[PDB]
Amino acid sequence: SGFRKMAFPSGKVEGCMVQVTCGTTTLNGLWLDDVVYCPRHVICTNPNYEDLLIRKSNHNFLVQAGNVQLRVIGHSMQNCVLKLKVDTANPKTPKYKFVRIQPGQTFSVLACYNGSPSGVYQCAMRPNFTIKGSFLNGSCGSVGFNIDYDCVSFCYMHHMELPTGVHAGTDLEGNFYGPFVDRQTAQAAGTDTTITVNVLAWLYAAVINGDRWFLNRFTTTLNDFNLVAMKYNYEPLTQDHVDILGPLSAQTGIAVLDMCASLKELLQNGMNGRTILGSALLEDEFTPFDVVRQCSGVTFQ
Amino acid sequence: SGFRKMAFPSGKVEGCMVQVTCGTTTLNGLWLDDVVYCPRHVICTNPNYEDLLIRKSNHNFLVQAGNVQLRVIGHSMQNCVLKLKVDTANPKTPKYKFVRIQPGQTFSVLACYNGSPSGVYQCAMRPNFTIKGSFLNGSCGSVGFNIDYDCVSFCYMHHMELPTGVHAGTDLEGNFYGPFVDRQTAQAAGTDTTITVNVLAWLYAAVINGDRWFLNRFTTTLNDFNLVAMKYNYEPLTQDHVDILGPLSAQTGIAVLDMCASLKELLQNGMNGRTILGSALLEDEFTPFDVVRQCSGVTFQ
Ligand SMILES: *[C@H](O)[C@H](C[C@@H]1CCNC1=O)NC(=O)[C@H](CC1CC1)NC(=O)[C@@H](NC(=O)OCc1ccccc1)C(C)(C)C
Ligand SMILES: *[C@H](O)[C@H](C[C@@H]1CCNC1=O)NC(=O)[C@H](CC1CC1)NC(=O)[C@@H](NC(=O)OCc1ccccc1)C(C)(C)C
């Protein structure tokens, strides 16, 4: 019992983190096989990164793997990431993949400074393609990831903080999530919405854990719910979302559209001082998979 | 910027987790040097664990270190933990200590099943010596820990779930936190309180992060605050607590007793639909150290 916002164990990723210093910029890099990936804004000196990178030399890049130097034997840029070719393959390279996630999906973040891990936490890709992380100067190059059995799917590399305190970054192929650029220009996040399928998943987690007070006799149609969703700045719920909530609906014996009726009432009436799973707000950064994973006990290695 | 409930990187602990099977009980163990620590209720068959342990043989204990067998060459019981002497020292043993924490202190939990890590999350030792964890059948033997630079301080080993869905366990010397026993007798948690110094720390985190709406002109004395604390089932605030909040008070320029006045108003008036750091409740599982750590970026290795 219990429900916590739970990150993946970070060991496999910790073994990949290195420090990349170039000029007076230090940030983190990800060392997989004989390549170190890091944000291209580590490059010296509106910037024109192809200009800037040709002025570079391999010896300009100081890569720190713990206390061991890594000799850079080549470099290239891939969209907004730099790939530093090094002469030693990381002996701790896990089985891995580069995946791009969808808004509403969750991942763990290993926050790092100077190539050293500070902490691990979970978050979601918001509908507006930002993440609500916890990142200070020097955190660039920290990565986000999911683990499936033994394989690390890297999905995020951190690049910048936007002026609402939210964060933006790229996939590991260097392509930004959202309409952001690695320029210290005026950029704004854009209007966010609540991830409806996740809120419903979390309501199922609450039921599995004994919070039942928000349940009701009522029911509703998918269209009548989506009419209320739009009013409260919730994302529309699709038949695919109803399908993915299926297993949770089966386990609890509450039909998806019934749990939607509960959410409608919660949206129109509030919680009246009650809490759900220790929260006084409707939580939307747990996916249906996160809930099943946590309430069935799937492990990794 | 940002504030997340952040766990320590779990790598150093992941390398210590093993599976201990004995009869039809499987749970987790902690493998440090040539000893495996696990809950003594793994023992066969109101139980009398000294009786039960003498009936035992070394070969009764199946210790799984990944896919490698560990031969048990001796066993002894230390309070409510078993120490299984094995013939191989764990080559991945970190620098470590066994520490007992105080109510109000926080730690990371590496939740494990069958010796394999499932996830990592942060929590606090409640004033009533329970923790609000996330634990399913098979999680016993999972540990809680803090990391200071390179040294892992183990503080918790998981043993049981109480009938409110909260969790109880021991330090690594086998001594329970709180008045609990490793007996499937009727046991109840006992009345909990809110950890006041932590709530104030979290309010300082909010100010550091730009939430300022709850701040006020007012002030108050330590005794007049503690009179309001007692009314709302908050722990009393001591001059020592005021002292530890000192650094946060300095950084923000808000005197501790002023932030107490803010908390009084929040207690008497509620939040009126506002949120603080993404919460509609007053959060009390961040210590002053957790806040400083996260808003200054301390790392580990
Ligand atoms: C890399 O270590 C840091 C991490 C960053 C610093 C504080 N929190 C963080 O996550 N990243 C950077 O320093 C960025 C480098 C730029 C991309 C090449 N810069 C920023 O994050 C930057 N934000 C920014 O310039 O974009 C928003 C903006 C700019 C101007 C006007 C309005 C909005 C800041 C200002 C945070 C350093
Ligand atoms: C070890 O893997 C499990 C972990 C436990 C199961 C579900 N969530 C958990 O954290 N621990 C046990 O199975 C415990 C072993 C007992 C200590 C020797 N048992 C329990 O946790 C047990 N709880 C319990 O017996 O105490 C509370 C109680 C008992 C009777 C009447 C009122 C209250 C349960 C019932 C959860 C298995």
Coordinates of C-alpha atoms and ligand atoms in Angstrom, one line a residue, chain A residues 25-28 39 41 47 49 113 134-141 158-164 166-168 176 181-188, chain B residues 1, ligand 1:
Chain A
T25 CA 31.6 26.5 -19.5
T26 CA 31.2 23.4 -17.5
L27 CA 28.2 21.1 -17.9
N28 CA 27.4 17.5 -17.8
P39 CA 24.3 20.4 -25.0
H41 CA 25.9 25.5 -26.1
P47 CA 25.0 32.4 -31.7
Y49 CA 26.9 27.1 -33.6
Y113 CA 26.4 19.0 -11.4
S134 CA 14.5 21.3 -10.3
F135 CA 17.6 22.6 -12.0
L136 CA 20.3 25.1 -11.0
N137 CA 23.2 26.6 -12.9
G138 CA 25.4 23.8 -14.1
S139 CA 22.7 21.2 -14.5
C140 CA 22.7 21.3 -18.3
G141 CA 23.4 17.9 -19.8
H158 CA 18.4 19.4 -20.1
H159 CA 19.2 22.7 -21.8
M160 CA 17.5 25.8 -20.3
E161 CA 15.1 27.4 -17.8
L162 CA 12.2 29.5 -19.1
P163 CA 11.1 32.7 -17.3
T164 CA 8.3 30.9 -15.4
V166 CA 10.0 25.6 -16.0
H167 CA 12.5 23.8 -18.1
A168 CA 13.1 22.9 -21.7
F176 CA 14.0 20.3 -28.8
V181 CA 15.7 27.2 -29.2
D182 CA 19.1 27.2 -27.4
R183 CA 19.2 31.0 -27.6
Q184 CA 19.0 33.4 -24.7
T185 CA 16.2 35.2 -26.5
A186 CA 12.7 36.0 -25.1
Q187 CA 10.9 32.7 -25.2
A188 CA 7.7 31.8 -23.3
Chain B
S1 CA 14.7 27.0 -10.1
Ligands
LIG1 C1 22.9 24.9 -18.1 O1 23.7 24.5 -17.0 C2 21.9 26.0 -17.7 C3 20.8 25.4 -16.8 C4 19.8 26.5 -16.4 C5 20.4 27.6 -15.5 C6 19.4 27.9 -14.4 N1 18.4 26.8 -14.5 C7 18.7 26.0 -15.6 O2 18.1 25.0 -15.9 N2 21.2 26.6 -18.9 C8 21.6 27.8 -19.3 O3 22.3 28.5 -18.8 C9 20.9 28.2 -20.6 C10 21.9 28.3 -21.8 C11 21.2 28.9 -23.0 C12 20.5 27.9 -23.8 C13 21.8 28.4 -24.3 N3 20.3 29.5 -20.4 C14 19.1 29.6 -19.7 O4 18.6 28.7 -19.2 C15 18.6 31.0 -19.5 N4 17.2 31.1 -20.0 C16 17.0 31.7 -21.1 O5 17.8 32.4 -21.7 O6 15.7 31.5 -21.8 C17 14.5 32.2 -21.3 C18 14.5 33.7 -21.5 C19 15.6 34.4 -21.9 C20 15.5 35.8 -22.1 C21 14.3 36.5 -21.9 C22 13.2 35.8 -21.5 C23 13.3 34.4 -21.3 C24 18.7 31.6 -18.1 C25 18.3 33.0 -18.1 C26 17.9 30.8 -17.1 C27 20.2 31.5 -17.6

